[PDB]
Design a protein around this ligand. Sequence first.
Ligand code: ZN
Length: 254
Amino acid sequence: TQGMSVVTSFYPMYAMTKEVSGDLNDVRMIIHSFEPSVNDVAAIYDADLFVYHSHTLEAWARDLDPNLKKSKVDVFEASKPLTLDRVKLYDPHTWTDPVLAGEEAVNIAKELGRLDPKHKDSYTKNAKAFKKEAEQLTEEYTQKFKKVRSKTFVTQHTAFSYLAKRFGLKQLGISGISPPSPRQLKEIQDFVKEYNVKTIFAEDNVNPKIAHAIAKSTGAKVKTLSPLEAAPSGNKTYLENLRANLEVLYQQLK
Ligand SMILES: [Zn+2]
């Protein structure tokens, strides 16, 4: 409507762009196994800016060909300047590390500014505030995590490896990069005991029966920890949502 038409692949892309773009543009949203519908694709070609995270995640972003469709959408890989770790094929889940969520918002600002130079400074300022909020979050939880009685946890999938590097914590996913054999089940329960883990973290929108069973047979409590891959209910900013989840983690490792 007003300003540029911006499309994004999934919640962390949507929320970072939205906060960095402030009230200037039109920001909309369209995961490991997701293919765009014919409507999604049409709406990408129709946009000025489509923001996705990594071709290691939304692999389909590469099949887009604005040249053929005589469209002028700018296909934009927001995590390019980020070094990704190998599994562990790379682990895409950088967004749950507050610092790295920062670098990526800063990057999305840069691109918005290329597309629309008049408000360049404005994108920049919003990115800086986001960055500086991410750093207050990193610090607060750097303090909090060095005084917990349990530094290890298990999550429904391997989505928190970056969050875990950042806070000196150890994680294991029941599934891997994407949402487990009989051996793996056994290995997970052994990991739980070797490290004495008191909470298995399910995620909403993935069937929790396997986490409950592991927890049951292992003396551990199931709880919920969101990779922020699906959009959260409510009206919190990206980092408010990331904070609430760091805090579930700490309440449980406390
Ligand atoms: Zn994931």
